Amino acid sequence: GASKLRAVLEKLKLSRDDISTAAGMVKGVVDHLLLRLKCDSAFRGVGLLNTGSYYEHVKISAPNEFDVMFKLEVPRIQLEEYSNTRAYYFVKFKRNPKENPLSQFLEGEILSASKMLSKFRKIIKEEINDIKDTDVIMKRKRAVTLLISEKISVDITLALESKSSWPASTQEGLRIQNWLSAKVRKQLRLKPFYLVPKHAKEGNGFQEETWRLSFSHIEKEILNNHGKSKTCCENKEEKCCRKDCLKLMKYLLEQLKERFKDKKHLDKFSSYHVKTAFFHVCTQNPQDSQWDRKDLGLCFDNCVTYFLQCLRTEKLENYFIPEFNLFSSNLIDKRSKEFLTKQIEYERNNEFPVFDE
Numbered sequence: 001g002a003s004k005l006r007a008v009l010e011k012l013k014l015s016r017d018d019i020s021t022a023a024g025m026v027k028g029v030v031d032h033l034l035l036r037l038k039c040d041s042a043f044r045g046v047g048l049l050n051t052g053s054y055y056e057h058v059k060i061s062a063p064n065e066f067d068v069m070f071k072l073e074v075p076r077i078q079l080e081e082y083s084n085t086r087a088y089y090f091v092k093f094k095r096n097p098k099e100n101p102l103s104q105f106l107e108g109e110i111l112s113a114s115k116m117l118s119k120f121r122k123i124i125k126e127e128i129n130d131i132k133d134t135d136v137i138m139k140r141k142r143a144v145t146l147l148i149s150e151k152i153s154v155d156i157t158l159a160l161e162s163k164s165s166w167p168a169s170t171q172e173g174l175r176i177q178n179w180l181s182a183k184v185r186k187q188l189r190l191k192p193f194y195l196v197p198k199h200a201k202e203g204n205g206f207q208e209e210t211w212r213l214s215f216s217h218i219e220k221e222i223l224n225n226h227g228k229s230k231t232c233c234e235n236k237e238e239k240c241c242r243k244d245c246l247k248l249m250k251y252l253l254e255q256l257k258e259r260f261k262d263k264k265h266l267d268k269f270s271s272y273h274v275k276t277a278f279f280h281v282c283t284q285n286p287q288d289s290q291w292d293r294k295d296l297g298l299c300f301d302n303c304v305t306y307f308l309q310c311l312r313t314e315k316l317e318n319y320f321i322p323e324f325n326l327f328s329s330n331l332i333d334k335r336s337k338e339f340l341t342k343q344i345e346y347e348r349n350n351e352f353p354v355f356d357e
Ligand SMILES: Oc1c2ccccc2nc2nnnn12
Pocket: 212, 213, 214, 215, 270, 272, 273, 318, 326
């Protein structure tokens, strides 16, 4: 069980130093763009958001690829749920003096996301040309992705920060009461929420004016504070395998994606799908005793088992938005699910050969 798994884990951990050697060139580009971005009136309150695999300590087989996020607060905003999606909204303002920096981006009462990102990419594109230390290139649209020294890639995302209360669609979400207590849940919900630009699927087109809720910052917190016990993983007697199981789940999918990249079945699947399923497993298994380090094998099998159940039943609720099904028949087709299902079941039945691969 754990024998082959922890062996894999040991291998992945060895990619520590290499992920930091390049971060120097990254930290340079990011800091440069932030200065020039603050120059523009609209992107004044722009700032780094310390949420991601970099800060969460969970990055696997993607050392060259980096992911950053730029948050921009929006003091007074009104949100409009789009087509009862429960996860996508419009950005309508409610300020007393209608003179906010985003004025130029408005397309009526609604805030244009397509135009918002246009200026964002526009500034970034113009900024990279300046620096002459390391050759930086902006990748074609297909939101901004940079290529540093032809070896390193950075995915820059723009998020709106609303320190207001979380939308009523999240009310029944984040079921961590029995796991992390109700006191913590109330605390976390007091934290702000973020909005990332993502169009919605429609018959003959997309909706390029919608934003999706983002709670990545909460996810980071929850992962670096995973135990029911406050001293979880702080002593030999209380060491668990929560973080290990997530890392393994992630790596498994990435491998299957890397293996079948040519066909493009798993192209729609993402690490978030795996992270979501994991959080649901944590809720199901609230006790630290259920995540004993000596039970890595058995614990990991549960995750795999649950993830498979989500694929078969085509049901995977957003951990914060219960009515949002990441695995909806419309979002992902049954065939693509049956394929990933088939592959994963094979791996489990053959002591996961995809790991040494
Ligand atoms: O990053 C994400 C999300 C982030 C926040 C909320 C829902 C999401 N749903 C997603 N499906 N694929 N990626 N992905």
